[PDB]
């Protein structure tokens, strides 16, 4: 219903926005109006470094060295098509969540209770293990603050919806 539609929209839109900013491209009107009220003045050079292995500063060094591959294997287990960008980049992690929520919509409409539960547990695992640590370590900026609040709310929602 409404919740899932909203979640799909936010993940897909935020992913698109970070892709555009990565490549120093203009944000299209459709995206802009969804997300305004603020800034879209994030430097492309900053955005290129919004990666888990870079932002999570206390990540054990040995883990930091294999982290992109850990991410890549997670994606492959859910048949997800990993971009041109590094696997631990925020744009890619958001795009992966977008794909999982899209699959959640299709499965809920098909009334597949078991698969639905599993896809929601995977969303929860991914957020707690990967996406949330990344977003909590973003520098301060209005777009970045928006993303962290959303992910924080999304983790709580997924937890309560699973128990
Ligand atoms: Cl720049």
Short mmCIF file of N, CA and C and ligand atoms in Angstrom, two decimals:
data_model
loop_
_atom_site.label_atom_id
_atom_site.label_comp_id
_atom_site.label_asym_id
_atom_site.label_seq_id
_atom_site.Cartn_x
_atom_site.Cartn_y
_atom_site.Cartn_z
N UNK A 1 0.88 -1.22 0.00
CA UNK A 1 0.00 0.00 0.00
C UNK A 1 0.89 1.23 0.00
N UNK A 2 0.38 2.31 0.59
CA UNK A 2 1.02 3.62 0.52
C UNK A 2 2.47 3.65 1.02
N UNK A 3 2.72 2.98 2.15
CA UNK A 3 4.06 2.91 2.73
C UNK A 3 5.07 2.41 1.71
N UNK A 4 4.78 1.26 1.12
CA UNK A 4 5.72 0.59 0.22
C UNK A 4 5.96 1.42 -1.05
N UNK A 5 4.89 2.04 -1.54
CA UNK A 5 4.98 2.94 -2.69
C UNK A 5 5.88 4.14 -2.38
N UNK A 6 5.72 4.72 -1.18
CA UNK A 6 6.58 5.82 -0.74
C UNK A 6 8.05 5.40 -0.63
N UNK A 7 8.29 4.25 -0.01
CA UNK A 7 9.65 3.72 0.16
C UNK A 7 10.34 3.45 -1.18
N UNK A 8 9.61 2.85 -2.13
CA UNK A 8 10.12 2.61 -3.49
C UNK A 8 10.54 3.89 -4.17
N UNK A 9 9.70 4.91 -4.03
CA UNK A 9 9.92 6.21 -4.65
C UNK A 9 11.17 6.89 -4.11
N UNK A 10 11.34 6.86 -2.79
CA UNK A 10 12.45 7.53 -2.12
C UNK A 10 13.79 6.85 -2.46
N UNK A 11 13.88 5.53 -2.32
CA UNK A 11 15.07 4.80 -2.74
C UNK A 11 15.44 5.02 -4.21
N UNK A 12 14.47 4.91 -5.12
CA UNK A 12 14.78 5.08 -6.54
C UNK A 12 15.22 6.51 -6.85
N UNK A 13 14.53 7.50 -6.28
CA UNK A 13 14.84 8.92 -6.52
C UNK A 13 16.21 9.31 -5.94
N UNK A 14 16.49 8.88 -4.71
CA UNK A 14 17.77 9.19 -4.08
C UNK A 14 18.92 8.55 -4.84
N UNK A 15 18.75 7.29 -5.23
CA UNK A 15 19.75 6.63 -6.08
C UNK A 15 20.02 7.44 -7.36
N UNK A 16 18.96 7.81 -8.09
CA UNK A 16 19.11 8.60 -9.32
C UNK A 16 19.84 9.92 -9.07
N UNK A 17 19.47 10.61 -7.99
CA UNK A 17 20.10 11.87 -7.63
C UNK A 17 21.60 11.72 -7.38
N UNK A 18 21.99 10.71 -6.61
CA UNK A 18 23.41 10.48 -6.39
C UNK A 18 24.19 10.09 -7.65
N UNK A 19 23.57 9.31 -8.55
CA UNK A 19 24.18 9.04 -9.86
C UNK A 19 24.45 10.30 -10.68
N UNK A 20 23.44 11.17 -10.80
CA UNK A 20 23.59 12.44 -11.49
C UNK A 20 24.68 13.31 -10.88
N UNK A 21 24.71 13.39 -9.55
CA UNK A 21 25.71 14.20 -8.86
C UNK A 21 27.11 13.63 -9.02
N UNK A 22 27.23 12.30 -8.99
CA UNK A 22 28.49 11.59 -9.24
C UNK A 22 29.09 12.05 -10.59
N UNK A 23 28.25 12.06 -11.62
CA UNK A 23 28.69 12.40 -12.96
C UNK A 23 28.58 13.89 -13.31
N UNK A 24 28.27 14.74 -12.32
CA UNK A 24 28.16 16.18 -12.55
C UNK A 24 27.10 16.52 -13.60
N UNK A 25 26.01 15.75 -13.61
CA UNK A 25 24.90 15.99 -14.54
C UNK A 25 23.79 16.74 -13.83
N UNK A 26 23.01 17.50 -14.60
CA UNK A 26 21.82 18.16 -14.08
C UNK A 26 20.79 17.16 -13.55
N UNK A 27 20.18 17.49 -12.41
CA UNK A 27 19.06 16.72 -11.86
C UNK A 27 17.78 17.07 -12.62
N UNK A 28 17.13 16.07 -13.26
CA UNK A 28 15.91 16.30 -14.04
C UNK A 28 14.73 16.76 -13.17
N UNK A 29 13.85 17.56 -13.76
CA UNK A 29 12.72 18.17 -13.04
C UNK A 29 11.93 17.16 -12.21
N UNK A 30 11.55 16.04 -12.82
CA UNK A 30 10.81 14.98 -12.14
C UNK A 30 11.44 14.55 -10.80
N UNK A 31 12.77 14.42 -10.79
CA UNK A 31 13.51 14.10 -9.56
C UNK A 31 13.52 15.26 -8.57
N UNK A 32 13.85 16.45 -9.07
CA UNK A 32 13.94 17.67 -8.26
C UNK A 32 12.69 17.88 -7.42
N UNK A 33 11.54 17.91 -8.07
CA UNK A 33 10.27 18.25 -7.43
C UNK A 33 9.81 17.21 -6.41
N UNK A 34 10.25 15.98 -6.60
CA UNK A 34 9.98 14.92 -5.64
C UNK A 34 10.69 15.20 -4.33
N UNK A 35 11.89 15.77 -4.42
CA UNK A 35 12.80 15.80 -3.29
C UNK A 35 13.01 17.18 -2.63
N UNK A 36 12.71 18.27 -3.34
CA UNK A 36 12.84 19.63 -2.78
C UNK A 36 11.93 19.87 -1.57
N UNK A 37 12.50 20.49 -0.54
CA UNK A 37 11.83 20.74 0.75
C UNK A 37 11.19 19.48 1.34
N UNK A 38 17.11 19.97 0.33
CA UNK A 38 16.97 21.35 -0.15
C UNK A 38 18.02 21.62 -1.22
N UNK A 39 19.29 21.48 -0.85
CA UNK A 39 20.41 21.70 -1.75
C UNK A 39 20.49 20.63 -2.85
N UNK A 40 21.09 21.01 -3.98
CA UNK A 40 21.64 20.04 -4.93
C UNK A 40 23.05 20.49 -5.29
N UNK A 41 23.61 21.30 -4.40
CA UNK A 41 24.97 21.79 -4.55
C UNK A 41 25.97 20.93 -3.79
N UNK A 42 25.91 19.63 -4.01
CA UNK A 42 26.96 18.75 -3.54
C UNK A 42 27.99 18.61 -4.64
N UNK A 43 29.25 18.89 -4.30
CA UNK A 43 30.35 18.73 -5.24
C UNK A 43 30.41 17.29 -5.71
N UNK A 44 30.61 17.13 -7.01
CA UNK A 44 30.82 15.83 -7.61
C UNK A 44 32.01 15.08 -6.99
N UNK A 45 33.08 15.82 -6.64
CA UNK A 45 34.26 15.21 -6.03
C UNK A 45 33.95 14.60 -4.66
N UNK A 46 33.05 15.24 -3.92
CA UNK A 46 32.64 14.73 -2.62
C UNK A 46 31.80 13.48 -2.84
N UNK A 47 30.81 13.59 -3.72
CA UNK A 47 29.88 12.51 -3.99
C UNK A 47 30.59 11.23 -4.44
N UNK A 48 31.66 11.36 -5.22
CA UNK A 48 32.41 10.19 -5.69
C UNK A 48 33.01 9.39 -4.54
N UNK A 49 33.27 10.06 -3.41
CA UNK A 49 33.85 9.40 -2.23
C UNK A 49 32.83 8.91 -1.18
N UNK A 50 31.53 9.00 -1.48
CA UNK A 50 30.51 8.55 -0.53
C UNK A 50 30.35 7.03 -0.60
N UNK A 51 31.36 6.35 -0.07
CA UNK A 51 31.47 4.90 -0.13
C UNK A 51 31.65 4.38 1.28
N UNK A 52 31.07 3.22 1.58
CA UNK A 52 31.21 2.61 2.90
C UNK A 52 32.65 2.45 3.36
N UNK A 53 33.51 1.92 2.50
CA UNK A 53 34.92 1.71 2.86
C UNK A 53 35.69 3.02 3.12
N UNK A 54 35.18 4.13 2.59
CA UNK A 54 35.80 5.44 2.77
C UNK A 54 35.18 6.19 3.97
N UNK A 55 33.85 6.15 4.10
CA UNK A 55 33.17 6.91 5.15
C UNK A 55 33.22 6.25 6.52
N UNK A 56 33.24 4.92 6.57
CA UNK A 56 33.18 4.24 7.86
C UNK A 56 34.62 4.16 8.38
N UNK A 57 35.03 5.18 9.12
CA UNK A 57 36.46 5.41 9.36
C UNK A 57 37.08 4.41 10.33
N UNK A 58 36.25 3.83 11.18
CA UNK A 58 36.69 2.81 12.13
C UNK A 58 36.56 1.38 11.60
N UNK A 59 36.16 1.23 10.34
CA UNK A 59 36.16 -0.08 9.68
C UNK A 59 37.56 -0.71 9.82
N UNK A 60 37.62 -1.97 10.32
CA UNK A 60 38.89 -2.67 10.44
C UNK A 60 39.58 -2.66 9.09
N UNK A 61 40.89 -2.47 9.11
CA UNK A 61 41.65 -2.27 7.86
C UNK A 61 41.50 -3.48 6.93
N UNK A 62 41.67 -4.67 7.48
CA UNK A 62 41.52 -5.90 6.70
C UNK A 62 40.10 -6.01 6.08
N UNK A 63 39.07 -5.55 6.79
CA UNK A 63 37.73 -5.55 6.21
C UNK A 63 37.61 -4.50 5.12
N UNK A 64 38.16 -3.31 5.36
CA UNK A 64 38.15 -2.25 4.36
C UNK A 64 38.75 -2.73 3.04
N UNK A 65 39.77 -3.58 3.11
CA UNK A 65 40.42 -4.12 1.91
C UNK A 65 39.55 -5.09 1.08
N UNK A 66 38.61 -5.81 1.71
CA UNK A 66 37.75 -6.73 0.94
C UNK A 66 36.29 -6.27 0.85
N UNK A 67 36.01 -5.06 1.32
CA UNK A 67 34.65 -4.59 1.49
C UNK A 67 33.81 -4.49 0.22
N UNK A 68 34.36 -3.88 -0.83
CA UNK A 68 33.69 -3.86 -2.13
C UNK A 68 33.30 -5.27 -2.61
N UNK A 69 34.19 -6.25 -2.43
CA UNK A 69 33.89 -7.64 -2.81
C UNK A 69 32.81 -8.29 -1.95
N UNK A 70 32.82 -8.00 -0.65
CA UNK A 70 31.72 -8.40 0.25
C UNK A 70 30.39 -7.86 -0.30
N UNK A 71 30.39 -6.59 -0.72
CA UNK A 71 29.18 -5.94 -1.25
C UNK A 71 28.75 -6.57 -2.56
N UNK A 72 29.71 -6.74 -3.47
CA UNK A 72 29.45 -7.35 -4.76
C UNK A 72 28.81 -8.74 -4.61
N UNK A 73 29.31 -9.57 -3.69
CA UNK A 73 28.76 -10.91 -3.48
C UNK A 73 27.34 -10.88 -2.89
N UNK A 74 27.07 -9.89 -2.04
CA UNK A 74 25.73 -9.69 -1.49
C UNK A 74 24.75 -9.42 -2.62
N UNK A 75 25.10 -8.46 -3.48
CA UNK A 75 24.31 -8.14 -4.68
C UNK A 75 24.04 -9.36 -5.54
N UNK A 76 25.07 -10.15 -5.82
CA UNK A 76 24.95 -11.29 -6.72
C UNK A 76 23.99 -12.36 -6.17
N UNK A 77 23.95 -12.49 -4.85
CA UNK A 77 23.03 -13.42 -4.20
C UNK A 77 21.56 -13.04 -4.40
N UNK A 78 21.31 -11.77 -4.72
CA UNK A 78 19.95 -11.32 -5.02
C UNK A 78 19.78 -10.92 -6.49
N UNK A 79 20.63 -11.49 -7.34
CA UNK A 79 20.61 -11.26 -8.79
C UNK A 79 20.66 -9.79 -9.17
N UNK A 80 21.40 -8.98 -8.41
CA UNK A 80 21.44 -7.55 -8.69
C UNK A 80 22.65 -7.11 -9.48
N UNK A 81 22.31 -6.35 -10.52
CA UNK A 81 23.15 -5.83 -11.58
C UNK A 81 23.99 -4.60 -11.14
N UNK A 82 25.22 -4.85 -10.68
CA UNK A 82 26.05 -3.80 -10.06
C UNK A 82 26.77 -2.82 -11.01
N UNK A 83 26.00 -1.84 -11.50
CA UNK A 83 26.54 -0.59 -12.09
C UNK A 83 27.94 -0.61 -12.74
N UNK A 84 28.52 0.59 -12.82
CA UNK A 84 29.91 0.87 -13.17
C UNK A 84 30.64 1.35 -11.90
N UNK A 85 29.86 1.88 -10.96
CA UNK A 85 30.37 2.43 -9.70
C UNK A 85 30.86 1.34 -8.76
N UNK A 86 31.72 1.69 -7.81
CA UNK A 86 32.09 0.75 -6.75
C UNK A 86 30.84 0.23 -6.03
N UNK A 87 30.89 -1.04 -5.62
CA UNK A 87 29.74 -1.70 -4.99
C UNK A 87 29.33 -1.09 -3.65
N UNK A 88 30.27 -0.47 -2.94
CA UNK A 88 29.94 0.18 -1.66
C UNK A 88 29.61 1.67 -1.79
N UNK A 89 29.41 2.15 -3.01
CA UNK A 89 28.99 3.54 -3.18
C UNK A 89 27.52 3.70 -2.79
N UNK A 90 27.19 4.82 -2.16
CA UNK A 90 25.82 5.08 -1.71
C UNK A 90 24.78 4.98 -2.84
N UNK A 91 25.11 5.48 -4.04
CA UNK A 91 24.22 5.40 -5.20
C UNK A 91 23.85 3.96 -5.54
N UNK A 92 24.82 3.05 -5.43
CA UNK A 92 24.60 1.63 -5.72
C UNK A 92 23.80 0.94 -4.61
N UNK A 93 24.13 1.26 -3.36
CA UNK A 93 23.42 0.66 -2.23
C UNK A 93 21.94 1.08 -2.25
N UNK A 94 21.69 2.34 -2.57
CA UNK A 94 20.33 2.84 -2.69
C UNK A 94 19.61 2.19 -3.86
N UNK A 95 20.33 2.01 -4.98
CA UNK A 95 19.76 1.32 -6.14
C UNK A 95 19.41 -0.14 -5.82
N UNK A 96 20.27 -0.82 -5.06
CA UNK A 96 19.96 -2.18 -4.59
C UNK A 96 18.69 -2.22 -3.72
N UNK A 97 18.56 -1.29 -2.79
CA UNK A 97 17.35 -1.21 -1.96
C UNK A 97 16.10 -0.95 -2.80
N UNK A 98 16.24 -0.08 -3.79
CA UNK A 98 15.18 0.19 -4.73
C UNK A 98 14.70 -1.09 -5.42
N UNK A 99 15.64 -1.92 -5.87
CA UNK A 99 15.30 -3.18 -6.50
C UNK A 99 14.57 -4.14 -5.53
N UNK A 100 15.05 -4.23 -4.29
CA UNK A 100 14.39 -5.07 -3.30
C UNK A 100 12.96 -4.61 -2.97
N UNK A 101 12.75 -3.31 -2.84
CA UNK A 101 11.42 -2.78 -2.55
C UNK A 101 10.47 -3.00 -3.74
N UNK A 102 10.97 -2.82 -4.97
CA UNK A 102 10.21 -3.13 -6.17
C UNK A 102 9.77 -4.59 -6.19
N UNK A 103 10.66 -5.49 -5.81
CA UNK A 103 10.31 -6.90 -5.69
C UNK A 103 9.30 -7.16 -4.57
N UNK A 104 9.38 -6.39 -3.50
CA UNK A 104 8.42 -6.46 -2.40
C UNK A 104 7.01 -6.10 -2.89
N UNK A 105 6.90 -5.06 -3.71
CA UNK A 105 5.61 -4.66 -4.29
C UNK A 105 4.99 -5.77 -5.14
N UNK A 106 5.78 -6.33 -6.05
CA UNK A 106 5.34 -7.41 -6.93
C UNK A 106 4.89 -8.64 -6.13
N UNK A 107 5.65 -8.99 -5.09
CA UNK A 107 5.35 -10.16 -4.27
C UNK A 107 4.12 -9.98 -3.37
N UNK A 108 3.91 -8.77 -2.86
CA UNK A 108 2.75 -8.48 -2.01
C UNK A 108 1.45 -8.54 -2.81
N UNK A 109 1.52 -8.08 -4.06
CA UNK A 109 0.39 -8.08 -4.98
C UNK A 109 0.07 -9.50 -5.47
N UNK A 110 1.08 -10.37 -5.46
CA UNK A 110 0.90 -11.78 -5.81
C UNK A 110 0.55 -12.63 -4.58
N UNK A 111 0.52 -11.99 -3.41
CA UNK A 111 0.18 -12.66 -2.14
C UNK A 111 1.10 -13.85 -1.79
N UNK A 112 2.40 -13.69 -2.03
CA UNK A 112 3.39 -14.72 -1.70
C UNK A 112 4.05 -14.46 -0.34
N UNK A 113 3.33 -14.82 0.73
CA UNK A 113 3.72 -14.52 2.12
C UNK A 113 5.15 -14.92 2.52
N UNK A 114 5.59 -16.10 2.08
CA UNK A 114 6.91 -16.62 2.45
C UNK A 114 8.04 -15.82 1.80
N UNK A 115 7.97 -15.68 0.48
CA UNK A 115 8.94 -14.90 -0.29
C UNK A 115 8.96 -13.42 0.13
N UNK A 116 7.77 -12.87 0.41
CA UNK A 116 7.66 -11.50 0.87
C UNK A 116 8.44 -11.30 2.17
N UNK A 117 8.25 -12.21 3.13
CA UNK A 117 8.96 -12.15 4.40
C UNK A 117 10.47 -12.16 4.17
N UNK A 118 10.91 -13.05 3.29
CA UNK A 118 12.33 -13.23 3.00
C UNK A 118 12.96 -11.99 2.36
N UNK A 119 12.23 -11.37 1.44
CA UNK A 119 12.72 -10.16 0.79
C UNK A 119 12.77 -8.99 1.78
N UNK A 120 11.82 -8.94 2.71
CA UNK A 120 11.85 -7.92 3.75
C UNK A 120 12.96 -8.16 4.77
N UNK A 121 13.25 -9.43 5.08
CA UNK A 121 14.36 -9.74 5.97
C UNK A 121 15.70 -9.39 5.31
N UNK A 122 15.80 -9.58 3.99
CA UNK A 122 17.00 -9.20 3.25
C UNK A 122 17.21 -7.69 3.23
N UNK A 123 16.12 -6.93 3.09
CA UNK A 123 16.17 -5.47 3.15
C UNK A 123 16.70 -5.04 4.50
N UNK A 124 16.21 -5.69 5.56
CA UNK A 124 16.59 -5.36 6.92
C UNK A 124 18.06 -5.66 7.19
N UNK A 125 18.47 -6.89 6.87
CA UNK A 125 19.89 -7.27 6.91
C UNK A 125 20.81 -6.27 6.17
N UNK A 126 20.45 -5.91 4.94
CA UNK A 126 21.27 -5.01 4.14
C UNK A 126 21.38 -3.63 4.76
N UNK A 127 20.26 -3.11 5.24
CA UNK A 127 20.27 -1.81 5.88
C UNK A 127 21.13 -1.80 7.14
N UNK A 128 20.95 -2.78 8.02
CA UNK A 128 21.69 -2.83 9.28
C UNK A 128 23.19 -3.15 9.09
N UNK A 129 23.50 -4.01 8.12
CA UNK A 129 24.88 -4.43 7.93
C UNK A 129 25.67 -3.44 7.09
N UNK A 130 25.00 -2.76 6.16
CA UNK A 130 25.71 -1.96 5.14
C UNK A 130 25.25 -0.53 4.97
N UNK A 131 23.97 -0.33 4.69
CA UNK A 131 23.50 1.00 4.32
C UNK A 131 23.47 1.98 5.49
N UNK A 132 22.94 1.54 6.62
CA UNK A 132 22.88 2.39 7.80
C UNK A 132 24.28 2.80 8.33
N UNK A 133 25.22 1.85 8.47
CA UNK A 133 26.59 2.31 8.84
C UNK A 133 27.15 3.38 7.88
N UNK A 134 26.91 3.22 6.58
CA UNK A 134 27.34 4.21 5.60
C UNK A 134 26.69 5.57 5.87
N UNK A 135 25.36 5.61 5.96
CA UNK A 135 24.63 6.90 6.07
C UNK A 135 24.87 7.63 7.38
N UNK A 136 25.11 6.88 8.45
CA UNK A 136 25.41 7.49 9.76
C UNK A 136 26.79 8.16 9.77
N UNK A 137 27.60 7.86 8.75
CA UNK A 137 28.97 8.39 8.64
C UNK A 137 29.12 9.42 7.52
N UNK A 138 27.99 9.90 6.99
CA UNK A 138 27.99 10.98 5.99
C UNK A 138 28.35 12.31 6.64
N UNK A 139 29.01 13.22 5.89
CA UNK A 139 29.24 14.56 6.43
C UNK A 139 27.92 15.32 6.50
N UNK A 140 27.89 16.43 7.23
CA UNK A 140 26.64 17.17 7.38
C UNK A 140 26.30 18.02 6.15
N UNK A 141 25.11 17.78 5.60
CA UNK A 141 24.54 18.55 4.49
C UNK A 141 23.06 18.17 4.39
N UNK A 142 22.19 19.12 3.95
CA UNK A 142 20.74 18.89 3.90
C UNK A 142 20.29 17.63 3.15
N UNK A 143 20.84 17.37 1.96
CA UNK A 143 20.52 16.13 1.26
C UNK A 143 20.97 14.90 2.06
N UNK A 144 22.19 14.96 2.59
CA UNK A 144 22.76 13.84 3.33
C UNK A 144 22.01 13.60 4.66
N UNK A 145 21.59 14.67 5.33
CA UNK A 145 20.76 14.56 6.54
C UNK A 145 19.41 13.92 6.24
N UNK A 146 18.78 14.32 5.14
CA UNK A 146 17.56 13.68 4.68
C UNK A 146 17.75 12.17 4.53
N UNK A 147 18.83 11.76 3.85
CA UNK A 147 19.06 10.35 3.57
C UNK A 147 19.24 9.57 4.87
N UNK A 148 20.04 10.10 5.80
CA UNK A 148 20.23 9.38 7.06
C UNK A 148 18.96 9.25 7.91
N UNK A 149 18.12 10.28 7.96
CA UNK A 149 16.85 10.21 8.70
C UNK A 149 15.93 9.14 8.09
N UNK A 150 15.82 9.15 6.76
CA UNK A 150 15.03 8.16 6.06
C UNK A 150 15.47 6.73 6.34
N UNK A 151 16.77 6.47 6.24
CA UNK A 151 17.29 5.13 6.46
C UNK A 151 17.09 4.71 7.93
N UNK A 152 17.30 5.64 8.85
CA UNK A 152 17.05 5.38 10.26
C UNK A 152 15.59 4.97 10.51
N UNK A 153 14.64 5.74 9.97
CA UNK A 153 13.23 5.38 10.07
C UNK A 153 12.93 4.06 9.38
N UNK A 154 13.57 3.83 8.23
CA UNK A 154 13.32 2.60 7.47
C UNK A 154 13.76 1.32 8.21
N UNK A 155 14.90 1.38 8.91
CA UNK A 155 15.36 0.25 9.73
C UNK A 155 14.38 -0.12 10.86
N UNK A 156 13.88 0.89 11.57
CA UNK A 156 12.90 0.70 12.64
C UNK A 156 11.62 0.08 12.09
N UNK A 157 11.14 0.64 10.99
CA UNK A 157 9.94 0.13 10.34
C UNK A 157 10.12 -1.33 9.93
N UNK A 158 11.27 -1.68 9.35
CA UNK A 158 11.50 -3.05 8.91
C UNK A 158 11.59 -4.00 10.11
N UNK A 159 12.27 -3.58 11.17
CA UNK A 159 12.36 -4.39 12.38
C UNK A 159 10.96 -4.72 12.95
N UNK A 160 10.15 -3.70 13.20
CA UNK A 160 8.83 -3.91 13.81
C UNK A 160 7.89 -4.72 12.90
N UNK A 161 8.06 -4.56 11.59
CA UNK A 161 7.26 -5.30 10.61
C UNK A 161 7.69 -6.76 10.46
N UNK A 162 8.85 -7.12 11.02
CA UNK A 162 9.36 -8.50 10.98
C UNK A 162 9.10 -9.30 12.26
N UNK A 163 8.87 -8.61 13.37
CA UNK A 163 8.60 -9.26 14.66
C UNK A 163 7.13 -9.17 15.06
CL1 LIG B 1 33.89 19.00 -7.98
#
